[PDB]
Amino acid sequence: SGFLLRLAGPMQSWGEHSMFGERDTLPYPSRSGLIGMFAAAQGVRRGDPLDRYKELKFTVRVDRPGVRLVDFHTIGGGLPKERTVPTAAGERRDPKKATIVTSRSYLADAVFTVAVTGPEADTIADALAAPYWQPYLGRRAFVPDPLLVLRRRVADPVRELVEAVPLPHRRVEEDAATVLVDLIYETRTLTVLNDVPLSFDSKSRRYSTRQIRVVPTEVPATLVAGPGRDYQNKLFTYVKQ
């Protein structure tokens, strides 16, 4: 069982621990987000039991860490006072203060290839191919790369993360081999953060911590693609086989 999910695209955000106007992303995908991505693909209404998703495992290798950028993002500004965001008391604030100013962060030009291994993950892959709601990378405005699922069915996909999945253009030294790539596994634990989603109900979303261990591993330098456009070519060669 298992399939390869490729998270790529111009921008993707995987925030955790932010609860005000400023938003912040983890430099790598968060299990909560990917689980919600599958739940959205399967029609799981907000508030439905998320234990079906329990028992999955997410090893994620970071091809390009990507640049982290902060996207300004106002809400309601430049509108007449009557048509701005409501207050909790119900009376709209004065128009010179009715604007909301959020500073949301997002990863741009970053690409990870998570190898999801679970009990029903093959039905989940078959659900991403025909989604109930549009899958997106973190914020809904970010739209996933068309090669969202590199392979629908793979026996031992981590074995395919160690090798035989192409890689972006990187420095390849003379007489070099085995270019270093950071794999992320789920003592030797990088960080602890609230990921595993106890409930997605918008009224009270709650989570619990998951330790992450990031192990730099060594994959053959043959894997990295040539400088220009070759990455797309090798990747497409990869999807048909």
């Binding site: 950028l69 300004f72 709209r92 030009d109 549009q134």
Partner: protein
């Protein structure tokens, strides 16, 4: 059933969106920085335009009213990608000075010196419409049908209002391609993961590059997707995008016809 629409609309010297400072918004994508027009800004103009022409489908096509309290449907189903330039773009500073009309025994002590940033380029826009949930939530397939058609026309016709009086950036897209897909929505954004080089323009080259990406994706995954595109150029054929149409509203009509 997912109706998605790609446009390659170019914009002259303008500053449609800007940061907390004056400079416009940029994605760093494909290793080359490129200006962008954020999704919410563009969405706001489209939603305002749809609600103005249409006279609660705006809470259905678009998820919820900003100034209304949540009515248990905050999701809009419609997905708006953030528009970004086909090529890499350097931010172009425009130094300006406001002139003082009353003259002292002094000349040119100008009223106000400053410098504002602008940029121009060919943005590759893209959107999605979750048709089935829109029908299940709206109820009547007809209101949904009119709403979907008018939403596509709004996506095409409009341009954001930002520094528009100083730069008349009003423009029509060069290419639109509406693909009624049943498998899943897909954006042709990776066609431009390698920013195109310059000095000969980008409209035509971006048109055939997006044609190459449509051939390849159509090749790996052959689908029952109904497609069609309309261009302001008759010089180049793009067979992978589907049957060509004489115009944009004729195209929108044929694809709205194709969804139902």
């Amino acid at each position: 059933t997912f109706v998605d629409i790609h446009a390659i609309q170019t914009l002259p010297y303008s500053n449609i969106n800007r940061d907390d400072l004056g400079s416009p918004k940029t994605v760093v994508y494909g290793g080359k920085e490129r200006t962008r027009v954020s999704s919410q800004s563009w969405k706001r103009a489209v939603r305002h335009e749809v609600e103005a022409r249409l006279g609660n489908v705006s809470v259905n096509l678009f998820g919820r009213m900003l100034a209304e309290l949540p009515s248990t449907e905050v999701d809009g189903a419609v997905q708006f990608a953030h528009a970004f330039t086909v090529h890499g773009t350097t931010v172009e500073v425009d130094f300006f000075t406001a002139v003082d009309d009353i003259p002292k025994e002094n000349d040119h002590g100008s009223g106000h010196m400053n410098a504002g940033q602008f940029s121009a380029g060919t943005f590759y826009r893209y959107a999605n419409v979750n048709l089935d949930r829109l029908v299940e939530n709206t109820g009547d397939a007809q209101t949904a049908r009119t709403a979907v058609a008018e939403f596509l026309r709004a996506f095409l016709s409009t341009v954001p209002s930002g520094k528009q009086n100083a730069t008349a950036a009003m423009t029509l897209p060069d290419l639109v391609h509406i693909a009624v897909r049943f498998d899943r929505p897909i954006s042709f954004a990776p066609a431009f993961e390698t920013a195109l080089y310059g000095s000969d323009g980008y409209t035509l080259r971006a048109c055939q590059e997006l044609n190459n990406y449509a051939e390849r994706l159509r090749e790996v995954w052959p689908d029952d997707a109904i497609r069609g595109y309309a261009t302001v150029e008759n010089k180049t054929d793009l067979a992978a995008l589907g049957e060509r149409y004489d115009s944009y509203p004729a195209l929108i009509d044929a694809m709205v016809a194709a969804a139902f």
